[PDB]
Design a protein around this motif. Structure first.
Motif, short mmCIF file in Angstrom:
data_model
loop_
_atom_site.label_atom_id
_atom_site.label_comp_id
_atom_site.label_asym_id
_atom_site.label_seq_id
_atom_site.Cartn_x
_atom_site.Cartn_y
_atom_site.Cartn_z
N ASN A 49 1.01 -1.11 0.06
CA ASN A 49 0.00 0.11 0.03
C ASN A 49 0.98 1.17 0.04
OD1 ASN A 49 -1.53 -2.22 2.35
ND2 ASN A 49 -2.76 -1.64 0.53
N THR A 50 2.20 1.41 -0.13
CA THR A 50 3.07 2.39 -0.07
C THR A 50 2.74 3.23 -1.35
OG1 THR A 50 4.99 1.15 1.10
CG2 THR A 50 5.37 3.10 0.24
N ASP A 51 2.91 4.43 -1.20
CA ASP A 51 2.75 5.40 -2.44
C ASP A 51 4.08 5.36 -2.99
OD1 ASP A 51 1.11 7.15 -3.55
OD2 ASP A 51 2.32 8.59 -3.12
N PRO A 52 4.21 4.98 -4.42
CA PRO A 52 5.48 5.19 -5.15
C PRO A 52 6.10 6.45 -5.21
CG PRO A 52 3.74 4.67 -6.69
CD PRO A 52 2.97 4.57 -5.38
N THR A 53 5.18 7.54 -4.87
CA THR A 53 5.57 9.06 -5.17
C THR A 53 6.51 9.46 -3.97
OG1 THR A 53 3.93 10.27 -4.00
CG2 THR A 53 3.42 9.19 -6.09
N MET A 54 6.78 8.56 -2.94
CA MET A 54 7.50 9.09 -1.72
C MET A 54 8.90 8.97 -2.16
SD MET A 54 7.51 7.33 2.15
CE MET A 54 7.80 5.66 1.46
N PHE A 55 9.40 7.85 -2.98
CA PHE A 55 10.68 7.74 -3.13
C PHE A 55 11.82 9.01 -3.50
CE2 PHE A 55 11.14 3.16 -2.10
CZ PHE A 55 9.85 2.86 -2.31
N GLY A 62 3.29 22.66 -10.51
CA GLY A 62 3.53 21.85 -11.53
C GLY A 62 4.35 22.71 -12.55
N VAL A 63 5.41 23.16 -11.84
CA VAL A 63 6.11 24.15 -12.87
C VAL A 63 7.50 23.27 -13.40
CG1 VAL A 63 7.65 26.32 -12.64
CG2 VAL A 63 5.46 26.49 -12.12
N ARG A 64 7.79 23.55 -14.54
CA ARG A 64 8.95 22.73 -15.11
C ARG A 64 10.04 23.73 -14.82
NH1 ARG A 64 7.10 22.62 -19.48
NH2 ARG A 64 8.18 24.11 -20.63
N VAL A 65 11.01 23.14 -13.99
CA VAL A 65 12.24 23.78 -13.57
C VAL A 65 13.42 23.22 -14.25
CG1 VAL A 65 13.80 24.04 -11.44
CG2 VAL A 65 11.27 24.47 -11.47
N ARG A 66 14.30 24.15 -14.77
CA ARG A 66 15.83 23.71 -15.48
C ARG A 66 16.62 24.66 -14.89
NH1 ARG A 66 13.55 22.30 -21.12
NH2 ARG A 66 15.28 23.07 -21.84
N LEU A 67 17.82 24.01 -14.17
CA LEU A 67 18.81 24.91 -13.55
C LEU A 67 20.28 24.62 -14.53
CD1 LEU A 67 19.10 26.80 -11.38
CD2 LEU A 67 20.05 24.54 -10.05
N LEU A 68 20.83 25.65 -14.75
CA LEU A 68 22.24 25.48 -15.52
C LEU A 68 23.24 26.19 -14.58
CD1 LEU A 68 23.11 24.36 -18.43
CD2 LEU A 68 23.33 26.67 -19.03
N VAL A 69 24.01 25.34 -14.41
CA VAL A 69 25.35 26.02 -13.49
C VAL A 69 26.59 25.90 -14.46
CG1 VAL A 69 24.33 25.33 -11.29
CG2 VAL A 69 25.80 23.64 -12.61
N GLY A 70 27.74 26.86 -13.91
CA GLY A 70 28.83 27.04 -14.63
C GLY A 70 30.15 26.02 -14.02
N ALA A 108 4.39 12.32 -11.50
CA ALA A 108 3.44 13.07 -10.39
C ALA A 108 3.55 14.54 -10.89
CB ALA A 108 3.98 12.93 -9.03
N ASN A 109 3.74 14.94 -12.27
CA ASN A 109 3.93 16.23 -12.59
C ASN A 109 4.94 17.09 -12.10
OD1 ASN A 109 1.44 15.36 -14.43
ND2 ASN A 109 0.02 16.42 -12.62
N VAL A 110 5.80 16.59 -11.54
CA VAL A 110 7.16 16.96 -10.81
C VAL A 110 8.27 16.97 -11.86
CG1 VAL A 110 7.96 15.37 -9.51
CG2 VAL A 110 8.43 17.72 -9.03
#
Ligand SMILES: *[C@@H]1O[C@H](CO)[C@@H](O[C@@H]2O[C@H](CO)[C@@H](O)[C@H](O)[C@H]2NC(C)=O)[C@H](O)[C@H]1NC(C)=O
Ligand SMILES: *[C@@H]1O[C@H](CO)[C@@H](O[C@@H]2O[C@H](CO)[C@@H](O)[C@H](O)[C@H]2NC(C)=O)[C@H](O)[C@H]1NC(C)=O
Ligand SMILES: *[C@@H]1O[C@H](CO)[C@@H](O[C@@H]2O[C@H](CO)[C@@H](O)[C@H](O)[C@H]2NC(C)=O)[C@H](O)[C@H]1NC(C)=O
Ligand SMILES: *[C@@H]1O[C@H](CO)[C@@H](O[C@@H]2O[C@H](CO)[C@@H](O)[C@H](O)[C@H]2NC(C)=O)[C@H](O)[C@H]1NC(C)=O
Ligand SMILES: *[C@@H]1O[C@H](CO)[C@@H](O[C@@H]2O[C@H](CO)[C@@H](O)[C@H](O)[C@H]2NC(C)=O)[C@H](O)[C@H]1NC(C)=O
Ligand SMILES: *[C@@H]1O[C@H](CO)[C@@H](O[C@@H]2O[C@H](CO)[C@@H](O)[C@H](O)[C@H]2NC(C)=O)[C@H](O)[C@H]1NC(C)=O
Ligand SMILES: *[C@@H]1O[C@H](CO)[C@@H](O[C@@H]2O[C@H](CO)[C@@H](O)[C@H](O)[C@H]2NC(C)=O)[C@H](O)[C@H]1NC(C)=O
Ligand SMILES: *[C@@H]1O[C@H](CO)[C@@H](O)[C@H](O)[C@H]1NC(C)=O
Ligand SMILES: *[C@@H]1O[C@H](CO)[C@@H](O)[C@H](O)[C@H]1NC(C)=O
Ligand SMILES: *[C@@H]1O[C@H](CO)[C@@H](O)[C@H](O)[C@H]1NC(C)=O
Ligand SMILES: *[C@@H]1O[C@H](CO)[C@@H](O)[C@H](O)[C@H]1NC(C)=O
Ligand SMILES: *[C@@H]1O[C@H](CO)[C@@H](O)[C@H](O)[C@H]1NC(C)=O
Ligand SMILES: *[C@@H]1O[C@H](CO)[C@@H](O)[C@H](O)[C@H]1NC(C)=O
Ligand SMILES: *[C@@H]1O[C@H](CO)[C@@H](O)[C@H](O)[C@H]1NC(C)=O
Ligand SMILES: *[C@@H]1O[C@H](CO)[C@@H](O)[C@H](O)[C@H]1NC(C)=O
Ligand SMILES: *[C@@H]1O[C@H](CO)[C@@H](O)[C@H](O)[C@H]1NC(C)=O
Ligand SMILES: *[C@@H]1O[C@H](CO)[C@@H](O)[C@H](O)[C@H]1NC(C)=O
Ligand SMILES: *[C@@H]1O[C@H](CO)[C@@H](O)[C@H](O)[C@H]1NC(C)=O
Ligand SMILES: *[C@@H]1O[C@H](CO)[C@@H](O)[C@H](O)[C@H]1NC(C)=O
Ligand SMILES: *[C@@H]1O[C@H](CO)[C@@H](O)[C@H](O)[C@H]1NC(C)=O
Ligand SMILES: *[C@@H]1O[C@H](CO)[C@@H](O)[C@H](O)[C@H]1NC(C)=O
Lengths: 414, 414, 414, 414
Positions: A290-296, B278-286, B310-312
């Protein structure tokens, strides 16, 4: 003459490594506590599933369950007061234990926790004879005795702490009256005389001890009662060596309140400790069907914090309980222990680690700190908790986040 | 009328993909600004390394810096005021261009930022004639013009924003008086008209635009001024579609204070946006040959929140620059861009993303918002910034966190 | 085993009505506190005028001050540590008592509050033996014992609260080191335990009691300490039945800072309580020969809100003290009591009601709440304070704002 | 070629002293505006009672309203678009003017302000042909033309200000669509181009003039729109010589809310100005048979601050309009003017001074600053407003707070 003994429940067909630390079984402790009762028994529980037919399954593992139920009935037959506080949005809606006990003579009140704060009454504790108490993660269910791994604390002959817990139980009771509302300020009856900065000092079997109780949500906290969140934060922030924690389920998000929001407090408190103070943080979580896979992903991020070259040491593992033959019974074979142990203190809680448990869902927890005393042979409570945690980690049932080999009985990626 | 054109510097021997979007070269914009100067030039800088011999390296790439210094001297020869504010704990110890300019008749003040708030004057902006204004992550340095890759913004002919940044420069200037202390309150002469709630309004080449300036630390923030942290948090929170950010370093902790402590404000904001909204996040570093390898674990932790189900969606990539034959030039061949792009705003700043840049180290940030105007030809500044970010993201020099390979130029732990 | 007893001093030639409530005399309490000292005495004071000749006037009323100085010298004889904190801009410059004690072996330190926060050290409290404390408005002066009406609180055998106050005393002591500056953040040493949110629970002589302290200015307030203004606002807001306040000076404006400003925080709080919550508000103000006539417009404005029909009752009275044949004594014959009592809490402070006292000068406060105990016992501290306030209100020496009798003593219209 | 004309309406049986300044009659200006319009007419009003039979009263003072309604019908005859926005909980409910206009062909849309923000649409302005505007306190009522003293402003041949007020009216109209909710962020057009820091500069009749509009509540303020509370605070703070104000009612509380709360923002601003800046503050609150008697204590509290010795002048008076033979007409014979005068600016609003008008109730306000021009013949708008205020103040119809003669036809104590 306060006595504190750790108690836990080992599920069926879960052998441990040879020469491993252990504490008293839960069923024996509960039976002895009920036998010693002579005046009244107060119990607050999430749900009641004492007998097997309540669920609808036909298994021999519920023998302890109906033994406990018949013990309750025979206790009621001896003219002993009995009060039960349970959440109105109960979990097992087909059970008849509450009705049977009420018919026998007990008084049961349904706390409308779902209407007052849009939550549930997750607290699980007893107050026996106003002197002996029980506190832990176990529920009034045979599965918690024979299928679900538990961990709790039972205290004997400690009237002050018993009345301290009875105050919270009385808040639950007075909230259970039909058509009741949250008082703006609680009367001067539920105010707690012991809190985080003024713990209850005592001699537990000749060992100095400081203890206090934490309550949640803040809407149900009387004056002078430390909140569960602040107790957790203080325990984590006072650490200097390590923070060993184990919960059934943990992620920095709000679950049952929409829209979902980030709840980064317990995570920030973990990372801040592990970085600034260089404390070895170890986290255990429960993985089940019953674990939610989104926790990982959150656990994977916490693991990615680790950096041995910079004195940042964070390790996260999951706990797998093999289902084996026990596939018919639902919501079982899960590591339901919720506690952490520090080199200084030892926290034994009831609620999980989420926003709702500390903002909307009722919970309770206790913190103890046993400094070394005049008996070198005796071992303090934090040492015992750490030994149990190390036994859990060293066990083959604990698999790291990277290890996702087939045969493990939980969703994993999902 | 206000004009706004983005300016960026492409390092030598760093070709881009065919058909990639481009912007106005930085050196050309600086020369245009100096040529158009007629009344006064006010420059706030961290350090001055205009000449090649100032560092001590004999290279032909410093010819453009020599030309810039010659143009500055010619401007000083036309009775043009030149005021320069520099941090007291400077970096190019052996620099002599500032002394030459002072001898020519320029006013230079060493701001004692080291002894005031235990920080430095990291702010790098530019005010010309009180009308033309430049601001970006480019120091007054020849390698910063031909070897390092930054991106700034120049605003032409538009006076109110120039007056606001002139107020900020005046705070820096009055702090430069010998034996000066931090005022408890700021006079009305230092008070920004435009902030988060009331941004500047203008018609940039027939296109509606809103903009405002931010400053740091809060000690040097008069009434009405918006803090850099506040502006960054507002820009992150307002975004509902995507968040694109480029910085040289991303440390969620303090960097120079003792003892170090966790500062999860930016990390919490990014995670909260990416999860709740649900914001698409892109990070670029030097990446550079001199980069702290302890930054990578935090980037990996931020990357771990990459569960598309999960829309993340969070992605992190590093941006390297090939050294080639330029190993003799120190502290170069790195990505110096410091900006954030969303679908409704475009933050351009000079500060990194550590705690000290918002607690003690001085800095300035610009938030510019543009909307589609009546004209159907041109594109908003957000679109150009997003296109530049995508060009950098898809470039062969940008690799994933797990993209470690032989021949790279990052420190890559070790 | 804490014991809280209200203490006050009644000036000579000031008879009260027959059967009026009375408390313990201040001189007896001070003498007993000095006698019970055996380890150390820590006192924070505004100025020292123990001896009559120090001011420059000979009178029989200075015998109490002479006896107090003799007791202090005797304590110094018995190897008793004595630490003294005094503001750099003292009031009574001609004070040889401090030199006498320093020669005898004291540890007087001059806190440069004037240079640091442009204020003075208005705190007046004792910490005897680290167990017993005294809090009140009575700076050590024979005029306070004999010629000035006073009120304070002394607590016995309450070591935890004594340490809580010793934290603030240690802050003052550390600030007294020559060539010292205000730290950006106070160390964990000075972090407080009890604030408005978690007060100190105790059974004071068989009566439940909650108490905590306050500090000012916010620059000198360490972590975990509630501000004096914040505590005052909380006490005002929580009251639901009445608010009785007696202060020497009440100005809704900055008193010493230039240019003058308006600070309506306390006035707004009083008006908001009296209007929204329908709470009776009574204000008593001391009126000596040195009072500023500009006081009275604000008091009359506060009084004008009195509307019995609309459930808005606000009353203001002026308490003058007859001079008679005590005119040779300067800075005397006034009402120095600074406290407010409500139906749920009692506040006893050492500062007046002005912007400087809460933003520039150093002061401490004490908020005590007592609940009716199970035993009948006597009366709560709130009840005693209310009775004292009623006795002062019904006294002939208290007059209305419009009752300016020709044969009065205060400045009135000037 | 913008022209600004101040318009006021002197009611019947209200003579004035010889030589008193006066402005153009309101009815004549309204008729001229209606005649000039040839493209479209947009109006916003609280209610619509243009005829005597609407209320149910037969009197010769309705002829002006009937003529105005006939003029509106004639304008509708010439095929001129006419849009109306009115509050859903309108004051007059038996009126039929809106139904007649809708039957003629004009579009009328109800604004459900009572459901969206729990307030009313108190705004009163016209926009004819998008070139001429009118803003004042006068409703669409014949009483406002004949039986109520009123003040307003009319702007001729000004495109930009007309467009801005058109944006405001467009927000009002968009809200009027059935089954509509408050947009989270208003679309691009609704954003305003002129605010308190970027006013619209123009040569009003040859003299320099800066003006901008203000709107309320914040829920209806698009980007770049200055909140009218902010405008009031700015014009109060910028004052350095005097603050002349005249409102119908003045409560530093909340009138229509539960529970009522104290709202001191305007009172605090007035007191702070009068004290710190030493500005002569004057008030002129209208009084009538329907006036609430509970306001007077607040006015007395405000006036009690008067202190010529300490340079505080907060003189307050009340305006009384004699009833005479017009007792039959309800809600009439009152001073309905709402404006502020200063040596710098001149604020004209459409709302009283209470928390409702700045929190829930909608409203608009116009701020006009007229610097002296090269030609001294044309008196600035601030001078005209000051002259009108002085004429009203020195008139026999203004009585001080102490004057309570029996023949004053006011409520006073009640
Ligand atoms: C709590 O205290 C009671 C009384 O002090 C204990 O009861 C006694 O236990 C001893 C030990 O077996 C017996 O010898 C006595 O006869 C008991 N007396 C009574 C009155 O019951 C009790 O055992 C204590 N609780 C625990 C858990 O030990
Ligand atoms: C990680 O912790 C260890 C343990 O303290 C550090 O090693 C040394 O520890 C001693 C303890 O007394 C210190 O006095 C030394 O300064 C520490 N460093 C060295 C080089 O001896 C170790 O330095 C820590 N890691 C980092 C990156 O600071
Ligand atoms: C600022 O504005 C001025 C005029 O308002 C611009 O000057 C004009 O520039 C154009 C194009 O460069 C020329 O064709 C005109 O001859 C110039 N006129 C004058 C009077 O100078 C100026 O270019 C603007 N600033 C910038 C940076 O473009
Ligand atoms: C503590 O108190 C005793 C007196 O009770 C002090 O004793 C005297 O000390 C001086 C020297 O400082 C000797 O000359 C005397 O003969 C002592 N008197 C005695 C012993 O009765 C003692 O000095 C004090 N402690 C200090 C100040 O160190
Ligand atoms: C504070 O505690 C002390 C003990 O530490 C109290 O002193 C005792 O008081 C009782 C009652 O007056 C006497 O019978 C004892 O003889 C006292 N003992 C000593 C050693 O003095 C004291 O009364 C308490 N209260 C105070 C000081 O106010
Ligand atoms: C002042 O307060 C009292 C009570 O606090 C109000 O009395 C109440 O009045 C209402 C309506 O008149 C009654 O329904 C309640 O039963 C009354 N309560 C009590 C306890 O008497 C009184 O009305 C208030 N005065 C004003 C002017 O509002
Ligand atoms: C109140 O205002 C008067 C002005 O009417 C102030 O009188 C000042 O007198 C000094 C003496 O030369 C001069 O600065 C001016 O004549 C006056 N000052 C101003 C600003 O007009 C008087 O000082 C004020 N009182 C206060 C501020 O307490
Ligand atoms: C449960 O199982 C046992 C064992 O097969 C059987 O004897 C019993 O009848 C079953 N009970 C029910 C209710 O099915
Ligand atoms: C319990 O009380 C009932 C009457 O209320 C009595 O008949 C019975 O004997 C009692 N039993 C015990 C065990 O006390
Ligand atoms: C509080 O407890 C006492 C007994 O200790 C009881 O008399 C009182 O009724 C209780 N208060 C309430 C509100 O129930
Ligand atoms: C589970 O099933 C297997 C296969 O029949 C059996 O060998 C084992 O004993 C069972 N476990 C039990 C009954 O606990
Ligand atoms: C720099 O190098 C050039 C040729 O590369 C040479 O002519 C010149 O003398 C050198 N100068 C210095 C200072 O090394
Ligand atoms: C500019 O400065 C030079 C040098 O001081 C001076 O001779 C000249 O008069 C100044 N003004 C000009 C060139 O217009
Ligand atoms: C504002 O006032 C400060 C205070 O001395 C002054 O230094 C500064 O030059 C002023 N700025 C102006 C007048 O623009
Ligand atoms: C969130 O994810 C679910 C399925 O994982 C999807 O149905 C839903 O559309 C997503 N949310 C948005 C805003 O697209
Ligand atoms: C480096 O030098 C080699 C040989 O001199 C040359 O082929 C190459 O193009 C140089 N690289 C750059 C980036 O100039
Ligand atoms: C004060 O006391 C008397 C006045 O009664 C006077 O004679 C004496 O000289 C005075 N003492 C001193 C020390 O001045
Ligand atoms: C600071 O704390 C240390 C350790 O608790 C203690 O030894 C020291 O005396 C403290 N200093 C102050 C000034 O409180
Ligand atoms: C002041 O006069 C009163 C009587 O008028 C007298 O009782 C008192 O003793 C006098 N004061 C002193 C200090 O003697
Ligand atoms: C009353 O109203 C009638 C119309 O209903 C009108 O004819 C008459 O003149 C009115 N009486 C007055 C105005 O005195
Ligand atoms: C208005 O429109 C109607 C439409 O039938 C038309 O008959 C009338 O002539 C128009 N009036 C004008 C254009 O003035």
């Amino acid at each position: 003459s306060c006595q504190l003994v750790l108690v836990e429940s080992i599920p069926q067909d879960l052998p441990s490594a040879a020469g491993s630390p252990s504490a008293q079984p839960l069923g024996q402790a509960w039976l002895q506590l009920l036998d010693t009762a002579q005046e009244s028994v107060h119990v607050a529980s999430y749900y009641w599933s004492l007998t097997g037919p309540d669920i609808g399954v036909n298994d021999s593992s519920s023998q302890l369950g109906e033994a406990l139920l018949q013990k309750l009935q025979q206790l009621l037959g001896r003219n002993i007061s009995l009060a039960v506080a349970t959440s109105s949005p109960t979990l097992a809606r087909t059970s008849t234990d509450l009705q049977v006990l009420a018919a026998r003579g007990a008084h049961v009140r349904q706390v409308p926790m779902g209407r007052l704060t849009r939550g549930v009454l997750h607290s699980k504790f007893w107050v026996v004879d106003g002197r002996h108490i029980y506190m832990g993660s176990a529920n009034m269910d045979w599965r918690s005795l024979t299928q679900v791994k538990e961990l709790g604390a039972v205290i004997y002959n400690c009237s002050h702490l018993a009345q301290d817990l009875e105050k919270t139980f009385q808040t639950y009771w007075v909230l259970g009256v039909p058509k009741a509302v949250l008082p703006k300020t609680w009367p001067q009856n539920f105010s707690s005389h012991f809190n985080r900065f003024q713990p209850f000092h005592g001699l537990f079997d000749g060992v100095p001890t400081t203890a206090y109780f934490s309550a949640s949500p803040p809407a149900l906290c009387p004056q002078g009662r430390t909140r569960d969140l602040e107790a957790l934060l203080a325990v984590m922030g006072s650490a200097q060596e390590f923070i060993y924690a184990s919960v059934m389920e943990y992620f920095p998000t709000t679950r049952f309140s929409h829209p979902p929001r980030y709840w980064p407090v317990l995570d920030n408190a973990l990372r801040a400790a592990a970085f600034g103070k260089g404390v070895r943080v170890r986290l255990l979580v429960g993985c089940g069907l019953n674990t939610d896979p989104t926790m990982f992903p959150y656990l994977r991020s916490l693991q990615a914090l680790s950096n041995p070259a910079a004195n940042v040491s964070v390790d996260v593992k999951v706990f797998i309980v093999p289902v084996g033959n026990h596939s018919n019974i639902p919501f079982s074979r899960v590591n339901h222990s919720k506690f952490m142990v520090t080199e200084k203190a030892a926290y034994i809680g009831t609620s999980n680690w989420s926003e709702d448990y500390f903002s909307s869902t009722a919970g309770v927890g206790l913190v103890v700190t046993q400094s070394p005393g005049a008996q070198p042979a005796g071992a303090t409570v934090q040492e015992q908790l750490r030994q149990l945690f190390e036994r859990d980690w060293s066990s083959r049932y604990a698999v790291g986040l990277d290890g996702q080999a087939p045969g493990q009985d939980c969703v994993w990626q999902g």
